[PDB]
Design a protein around this ligand. Structure first.
Ligand SMILES: [Zn+2]
Lengths: 293, 49, 142, 142
């Protein structure tokens, strides 16, 4: 992505894609996934079947937790009866009873952990739509595992590219015009700004896809003159240094993807590449500027 | 429909977790007893009336 | 070679075939039948949410295989009981083989249409069904 | 909304991503690598005795999946060590990210061509390989 946009004030991407800067930067630097497209009508046809499948699975976790609770409660009751038979002091009775009660509380709370996770999964499944965000990777991992069928969501610049190219401008422009036709100044000003940006896009005759680059150019060599000192040292404009960094990192990416490796390293490496390109198009725009000497 | 609720004639799918499933062994559907109240039958005539 | 050999009793073949049985003492049978229930539920859901392409696409098939295996043992569980009850009703002219076969049919008709439903030992239910089946067999033989 | 937010350090993202690691104390790594060996042997035999139609036709595929999973964790095992060794060789002008990435490449090149062979802790071997890789990176940077 082009540093001049996801960091600019106003951030053209934020207005066009109606995303907060926090979410956009998390998406760009590979922090939190995004949901691209969802065949909502296809999910709707079996929404009842999905809910039934939910009922049976949640009843299954209910049955396992109930069995565990029954087993542990019977064990504690048997232990208390044994202690009474031995005629031990009430201190031992309360120690064992508190231990067992805390064990059962922990068991029930873990059951509740599973149940609340399941309802979170559902909630996020049913009320699911584009432009939504999932901060935690584990929950998304879970979603794609249990239901990896309907919604396809990836992380990185290509995610934004697919979202925008799949996105349409005229419909949003009409909706914003309709909102403006109404009142409610508070939201009306935001609608006005977004409509201005979208109308500029539409009138330009271009497409937003220009905000995601695949081929940066390089200026001629003379513009970045190369200088030889008494010892022939390289002390010319660092433009050569920045291009060195970008090219080197791209070649590392290519070699690594050729060799094969898990997602973590590849994603980290892509983040590093994005950082370098942002630095080259501008140093010090955001974050610590690079400093060699 | 079934005389009882969530009960196949033959007992093959008597468990609660079956809705919309017609039992091939007995050829009946599994839904609450209420559905018995809202389904009809038509007799076929051999001579118009 | 062409030396002759004695025949073998049919009952003894049955005993040899069932000697591998090992009753589970009526305790684990409930989970044994929870394997069948989950198997049938896997059956249904396999052909209801068909589109889903996932690693789970094999787990349910494994649950169906577990259900097929869980029945193959449950049926083995009760052959001693059925043979005993059959032998209890001999002496009426029928070969013990025909009665025990009929009881075997009655059992298979039973357990496959039985639910724990927080019920008692399934052995009582099997004894009842096989007894009814063998009584019907004797009555129809006349 | 259009309020601005501060950026995030790249290193902290790495720490968050690797916080899930849990070293196995060098003890279970041998079986961990026996899962990879058996996986590769499943690879070969899957495409060598192809005709066989059997229930085992899925077990070896599961062994290959176990081998794929066993590596995904083994690699996670050593990221703390590689980041430490990389940080030990800083201050020469390179961003820590480039050095740690290079060490990551060196590690993946190592362990995937390593055998226990009744060898010592694989941590020493990984440290050696990543140190050589980062030294080479620094040397070629000049
Ligand atoms: Zn039926």
């Amino acid at each position: 992505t082009h540093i001049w946009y996801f960091k600019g004030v106003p951030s053209r991407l934020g207005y066009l894609l109606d995303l907060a800067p926090k979410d956009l930067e998390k998406i760009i630097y590979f922090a939190a996934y995004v949901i691209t497209s969802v065949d909502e009508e296809m999910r709707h046809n079996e929404l009842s079947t999905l809910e039934a499948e939910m009922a049976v699975e949640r009843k299954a976790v209910e049955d396992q937790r109930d069995g565990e609770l029954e087993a542990r409660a019977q064990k504690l009751e048997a232990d208390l009866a044994e202690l009474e038979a031995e005629g031990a002091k009430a201190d031992a009775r309360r120690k064992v009873r508190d231990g067992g009660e805390r064990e059962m509380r922990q068991i029930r709370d873990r059951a509740q952990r599973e149940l609340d996770r399941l309802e979170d999964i559902w909630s996020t499944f049913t009320k699911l739509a584009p432009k939504q965000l999932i901060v935690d990777e584990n929950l998304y991992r879970e979603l794609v595992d249990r239901y990896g069928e309907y919604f396809t969501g990836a992380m990185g610049a290509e995610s934004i590219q697919k979202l925008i190219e799949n996105f349409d401008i005229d419909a949003e422009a009409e909706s914003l015009r309709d909102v403006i036709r109404n009142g409610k100044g508070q939201k009306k000003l935001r609608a006005l700004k977004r409509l201005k940006v979208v109308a500029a896009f539409q009138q330009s005759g271009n497409s937003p896809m220009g905000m995601v680059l695949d081929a940066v150019p390089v200026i001629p060599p003379e513009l970045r003159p190369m200088v030889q000192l008494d010892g022939g040292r390289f002390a010319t404009s660092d433009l050569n240094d920045l291009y060195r960094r970008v090219i080197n990192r791209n070649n590392r990416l290519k070699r690594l993807i050729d060799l094969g490796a898990p997602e973590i390293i590849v994603n980290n490496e892509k983040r590093m590449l994005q950082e370098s390109v942002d630095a080259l198009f501008d140093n010090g725009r955001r974050g610590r500027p690079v400093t060699g000497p | 429909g079934p005389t009882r609720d969530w009960e196949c004639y033959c007992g093959k799918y008597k468990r609660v977790r079956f809705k919309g499933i017609i039992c091939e062994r007995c050829g009946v559907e599994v839904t609450r007893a209420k559905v018995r109240r809202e389904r009809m039958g038509h007799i076929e005539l051999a001579a118009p009336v | 070679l062409d030396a002759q050999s004695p025949a073998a009793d049919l009952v003894r073949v049955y005993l040899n075939g069932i000697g591998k049985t090992a009753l589970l003492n009526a305790a684990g049978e409930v989970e044994l039948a929870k394997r069948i229930e989950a198997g049938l539920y896997a059956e249904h859901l396999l052909e209801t949410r068909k589109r889903l392409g996932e690693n789970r696409k094999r787990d349910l098939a494994a649950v169906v295989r577990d259900g097929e295996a869980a029945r193959r043992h449950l049926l083995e569980a009760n052959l001693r009981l059925v043979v005993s009850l059959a032998k209890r009703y001999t002496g009426r002219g029928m070969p013990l083989l025909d009665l025990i076969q009929e009881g075997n049919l009655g059992l298979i008709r039973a357990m496959e249409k039985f639910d724990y439903t927080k019920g008692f030992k399934f052995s009582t239910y099997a004894t009842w069904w096989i007894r009814q089946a063998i009584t019907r067999g004797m009555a129809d033989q006349s």
